[PDB]
Amino acid sequence: DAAIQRAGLLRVQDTHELFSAVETLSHMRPLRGDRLMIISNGAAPAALALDALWSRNGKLATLSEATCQKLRDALPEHVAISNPLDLRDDASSEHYIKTLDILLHSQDFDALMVIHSPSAAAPATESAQVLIEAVKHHPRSKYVSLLTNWCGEHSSQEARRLFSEAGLPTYRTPEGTITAFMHMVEYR
Amino acid sequence: GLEALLRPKSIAVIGASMKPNRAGYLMMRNLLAGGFNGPVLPVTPAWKAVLGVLAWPDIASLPFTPDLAVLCTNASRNLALLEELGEKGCKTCIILSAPASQHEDLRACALRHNMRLLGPNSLGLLAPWQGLNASFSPVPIKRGKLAFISQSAAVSNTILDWAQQRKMGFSYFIALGDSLDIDVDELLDYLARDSKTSAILLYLEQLSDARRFVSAARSASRNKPILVIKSGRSPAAQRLLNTTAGMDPAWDAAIQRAGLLRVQDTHELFSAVETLSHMRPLRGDRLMIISNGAAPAALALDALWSRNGKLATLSEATCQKLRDALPEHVAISNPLDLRDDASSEHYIKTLDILLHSQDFDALMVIHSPSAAAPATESAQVLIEAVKHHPRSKYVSLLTNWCGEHSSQEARRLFSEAGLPTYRTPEGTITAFMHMVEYR
Amino acid sequence: GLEALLRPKSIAVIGASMKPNRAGYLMMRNLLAGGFNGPVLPVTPAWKAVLGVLAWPDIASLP
Amino acid sequence: QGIKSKKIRARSALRPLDVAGLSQLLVQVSNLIVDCPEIQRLDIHPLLASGSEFTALDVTLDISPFEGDNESRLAVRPYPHQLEEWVELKNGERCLFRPILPEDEPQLQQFISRVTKEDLYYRYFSEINEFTHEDLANMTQIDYDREMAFVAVRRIDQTEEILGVTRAISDPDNIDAEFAVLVRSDLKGLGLGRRLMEKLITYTRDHGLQRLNGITMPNNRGMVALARKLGFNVDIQLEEGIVGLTLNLA
Known part of the structure; x- marks a missing residue:
């Protein structure tokens, strides 16, 4: 451990x-911060x-008052406007895009983590397609790191394949993403 | 009693609709695709039939009194509709949503009419052995032997998604809400006495009174294994879920006292789903x-x-018999047989000799795909070898085929045969140590 | 006229059964999987409901 | 557990740590706090452990007045040893009536072999079933608040052999209960069942219940004769062959 620290390298357990290291060393761009x-x-x-x-x-992120105001009026009954984890129950793809476009315009964070639990309102494949095109057409996507987590093993194979084709990191479980994020932060 | 809920004879859906964007639509479609043996009665004045079934305008026009009622209408009408049901004389009702108030009026009405409520904001109930699917979920389930209880609707949906995508069969699946009238302690007795259930799984976020929880869990823990998972450990998690904070180390003490087991993530x-099914109870720890x-x-x-x-030590007779199977295998002098280019023939020649001894309590077989021994053939050969041996009843089996791309068919065959299988090493050891600690 | 045949508003299946080896079973299953916009009425005294639909004993008891 | 997880060091001094003395000290603390409810907080800091001796340096007590029942404040309730009884039978034989323990499971499996079939039925959820081994194993694990069970036991050659069992289960609202009694073959006519039923009646009336419910077969005349001797209601169900017993404790 002492020698590895001295040489400037990183150690993984198992x-x-x-x-996760294979998925993060490729497909993930280097960070500029820790929010x-x-x-x-x-x-x-x-x-x-x-x-985790x-x-x-x-480190978490804090939202600006302008970003908070813009996010409001997108859909009512969303208390999650007042925390750095937007929260929905029966949202659709439109809410996903209307959140992504506003969020990518700010200067509030350094990495975005999107979680999906399959539901009738938002099927996995179409949501993945919409996310991919939205990231494609935005001009600020260069300066942000992206992490995805589609949590349905049976029904998310095609979405995961599409993500891999687009060159986007993707992880099977939550706090498997946090492990990679903290790995990179510690390395930097 | 809970027999009108877990074993109804008739159901009335209040709010049944022909609009695909509705909860009544999904409830009716789920109920008609399950295999129920009683009538399903839609109540609505906005249609003459829903999905091909004649509808009724109001509760008073129902031909007879139902056993179970599901409220798919809005919250504003709740207090009125319940009253009507009380006049009719129904026993239990499932409520979809409430605005976090009028819990007092709901409890008063239920007590006045002697009715039982499944907590508001509940995803529903699934009983495959009765062909009952009184739920709002979008994924199917299968018959099995594992019962699951969940607390939050977000938790319930996340967990059922993770489960169905994990595919595992179930015996019961109940999603509580605010636990206004029906709680965990009451369900534990029924589940313990049940015969189709073989293990119980919990997901807890908060409790009302821990005394009855500990008492009932203690009573039910001597029949089947029981496992838990809790998530209120950090201040941000505490604030997002709206729960109290400073009692975490007491939860470990209570769980230990009741005789249960805790998992982290x-x-x-x-791994717990794979091990609670498909794995027989142990007799030791070697x-x-x-x-x-x-x-x-x-x-x-x-790991x-x-x-x-604990590891196993091999007898001199078994060591001698293993020798002459092939040279250049020093591994006869350790509890980890080792090869580099072995074929399936060596696998069977090892399995047959090893299964004949009385040296261990569990066997762990690891495979790294190679040209000499393809995955599918090795899987088939191992399955047949386990089939034909007479000693296989007294041994626990664990498998680990380590090739993701090329080992899907082998894993499917293992699952069909009823054999546990795990993606990576030290995922098998975690399950083995879990079971040892439980015992 | 042929408008009660090519464009019915209601249908009564006489002989509906819960035995998969029957024509009533197949008729009910085909009728409930089509997208019909009217009631399907099973008539039989040997069951209380067929595939989840309340049944009637005889023709005279139809509402 | 504390030592192994390295929460507490074992050889912080030149000598090891003795565990018997520390465990005895903890047991004494538990006795003290459970006995006295006026204590709200206790703090012993530092606690001096020197080999086999343990001593207190500074102790602080924060106390408050009043207490309702001194028992509801806990989560696990102890074993009621004040119900243990010695009874001389009709024929002058001695036996012991006492609450059940988890150690009685083996004895319970043999006693079930030598019991008639008719009496082995009970009513669960509007259904009639009959006792199996799992039911008895479950019966051994009890909380002595909402469910109770008594056994009659005999001692021979340093073994315990069971003669009769009785059980009572109460509802959440504390207004109804269901009972069951089982006696061994070749033991009938000695009043054992009557004694067990009297012991159950006493306990249930003291608990604060209203009535007691049960069922048995019509062909079995001994149990109905005993219930009549009590003089408590017996109804008979036709077309099913079940006789319902009701005993109103007033």
């Missing part, structure tokens, strides 16, 4: 973090992430 | 490993070394 923003259509997944980020002393 | 949760490579087993050993596990 092979379960090793294919993280999360969006999801369910409460528990984000919570499971937070605990809390066990490695990670 | 969801990555060990699908483990034997065989593989066609040094590194994988090594990666396992370290087993970090949880204080």
